[PDB]
């Protein structure tokens, strides 16, 4: 009954750690078109 | 017979030192119950 007593709190709060982790999926593609958009500029600095 | 007032609270307490609150509170906590909107 120990066991069966607290499992909302341990569903609510492995949801959250789901949730930041998709998060941190979006941030690593977009650092990475950032890091593509700054290679354009370096290419571009040097056409100018 | 009468039953007055000091006979009853006796009664009372004679019929409130058996029951047991804890098994109920443990009974309206399994898994039967426990998420009720």
């Not at chain 1, 009954?1 to 999926?25: L, P, R």
């Not at chain 2, 804890?22 to 309206?28: A, E, N, P, R, V």
């Amino acid at each position: 009954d120990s066991i069966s007593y607290s499992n909302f709190s341990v569903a609510e709060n492995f949801q959250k750690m789901k949730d930041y982790y998709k998060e941190i999926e979006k941030l690593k593609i977009k650092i990475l078109q950032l890091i593509e958009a700054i290679k354009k500029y370096q290419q571009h600095v040097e056409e100018l | 017979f009468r039953l007055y007032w000091d006979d009853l609270k006796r009664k009372l307490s004679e019929k409130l030192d058996s029951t047991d609150f804890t098994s109920t509170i443990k009974l309206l906590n399994e898994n039967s119950y426990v998420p009720r909107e």
